[PDB]
Structure formats: C-alpha cells, structure tokens
A paper describes a structure:
Some viruses, such as [name] (EBV), encode homologs of the mammalian pro-survival protein Bcl-2. We have therefore determined crystal structures of [name] in complex with its key targets, the [name] domains of [name] and Bak. Our three-dimensional structures show that these interactions closely resemble those seen with mammalian pro-survival proteins such as Bcl-xL.
Binding was observed with peptides from the [name]-only proteins [name] (KD = 18 nM), Puma (70 nM) or Bid (110 nM). It will therefore be interesting to investigate which pro-apoptotic protein is the critical target for [name] in diverse cell types, especially those targeted by EBV during oncogenesis. It is noteworthy that in some lymphoid cells, the pro-survival action of [name] tracked with its ability to bind [name], which is critical for apoptosis induced by multiple stimuli in this cell type and plays a role in suppressing myc-driven lymphomagenesis. As the characteristic hydrophobic surface groove was absent in unliganded [name] due to the close proximity of helices α3 and α4, significant structural changes are required in order to accommodate [name] or Bak [name] domains. The side-chain interactions contributing to the [name]-[name] complexes are equivalent to those observed for mammalian pro-survival proteins such as Bcl-xL, with the four conserved hydrophobic [name] residues of [name] (I58, L62, I65 and F69; numbering based on human BimL) protruding into pockets within the [name] hydrophobic binding groove. In addition to the hydrophobic interactions, [name] R100 forms a salt bridge with [name] D67 or with Bak D83. The conservation of aspartic acid in the mammalian [name] ligands suggests that this interaction is of particular importance for complex formation, and indeed a [name] R100A mutation reduces [name] binding and abolishes interaction with Bak.
Numbering used by the authors:
A (entry chain B): 51 to 72
B (entry chain A): 2 to 158
The structure:
C-alpha cells in the first residue's frame, strides 16, 4: 500500500546521489 | 526569497507553455492565483532550472515513467501520498542539491504527464499539483540555508 512510495523515494534518493557527482 | 512552491509552480507552467498547445490546465491557473505566484515562468532563473530538470528527466526517462505510473495507479488519496514520497527522500540523511533537483524534476514530469493526457480526470490533475506543491514547501528551510534557488543556479550548478 505504502510500498510504491518507498520504492519511488529509493529511486529518487539514488538519482539525487548520482547527480551530486555531476 | 522565492519559495519552493513558487519555483516549482513557475517550472510547471513554463513546461506547459512549451509542450502541446502551450495552454495552461485550469489547475495551474488556480494554483497561480492561490499560492500566489510572484515569479514569472519566463524569468531566467525558471528557464535555467527548466533545462536542468529536463536533463534529469531525459537521463532517467524510464525510471520517471515507471515511478509515476506506479504511484498514480496505486494511490487512493493523491495529495496525501506526495507527502510520503517527499519525507522519505529528505529526512533520510541530510538534503542535498541532487536530491532536491531529483524531486523537482519528478514533480515537473508528473505534472507534464497529467496535463498532456486529455483523458486524465480533472480531480487527479488538481490533487496531484496541489500535493506536489504542498509537499515541496518542506524544502524551504534547506534551500534558504543555501542562499535561495537563485543563488544555487547562478553560483553552484
Ligand atoms: Br527504504
Ligand atoms: Br509573467
Ligand atoms: Br541525473
Ligand atoms: Br523523457
Ligand atoms: Br485521489
Ligand atoms: Br497520469
Ligand atoms: Br479541465
Ligand atoms: Br474530476
Ligand atoms: Br548567472
């Protein structure tokens, strides 16, 4: 139920951390 | 001193101005009235962020498509659910520029998807734009600590 939202946040944290070296 | 809500809303409007008919969904008109938006969508700071966020969307095209589709097809209360995504990004370690931009790009991509699909019910567009704008207020403390949105683009990105 709240599972989609935790996956989404995992992905955006990852994307944001990749950018931090960009 | 422009708020995160103002800059996100200006980005979404600009993004609408440059996709499809260039027409604004009634929901974006409403949000401009009610915020109230004091930033121009044609302001250079908005054009500059718009390019950075479009670069992030394009680089992560499929992941943005998938995450948004999963979100919108599983939610039973769209505006509330934006808040949950937000907190899991920004209170899970310190906020960073990258995470802030990743969030803003995801929101702008969601708004673009919702506004380009002529079949999308009004209430789904309305609650999503309200949801993203309200949740984004949570960035104001940290971005102020960085000298504001304008400082970040002019000097750090
Ligand atoms: Br997690
Ligand atoms: Br204007
Ligand atoms: Br990226
Ligand atoms: Br794309
Ligand atoms: Br809903
Ligand atoms: Br949609
Ligand atoms: Br409508
Ligand atoms: Br409706
Ligand atoms: Br500059």
């Amino acid at each position: 139920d709240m599972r989609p939202e935790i996956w989404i946040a995992q992905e955006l944290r990852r994307i944001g951390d990749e950018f931090n070296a960009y | 001193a422009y708020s995160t809500r103002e800059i996100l809303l200006a980005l979404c409007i600009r993004d609408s101005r440059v996709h499809g008919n260039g027409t604004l969904h009634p929901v974006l008109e409403l949000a401009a009235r009610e915020t109230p938006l004091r930033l121009s969508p044609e302001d250079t700071v908005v054009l500059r962020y718009h390019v950075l966020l479009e670069e992030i969307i394009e680089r992560n095209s499929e992941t943005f498509t998938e995450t948004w589709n999963r979100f919108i097809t599983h939610t039973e209360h769209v505006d509330l659910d934006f808040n949950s995504v937000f907190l899991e990004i920004f209170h899970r370690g310190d906020p960073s520029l990258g995470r802030a931009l990743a969030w803003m790009a995801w929101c702008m991509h969601a708004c673009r998807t919702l506004c380009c699909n002529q079949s999308t019910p009004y209430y789904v567009v309305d609650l999503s734009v309200r949801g993203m704008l309200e949740a984004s207020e949570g960035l104001d403390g940290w971005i102020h600590q960085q000298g504001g949105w304008s400082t970040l683009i002019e000097d750090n990105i």
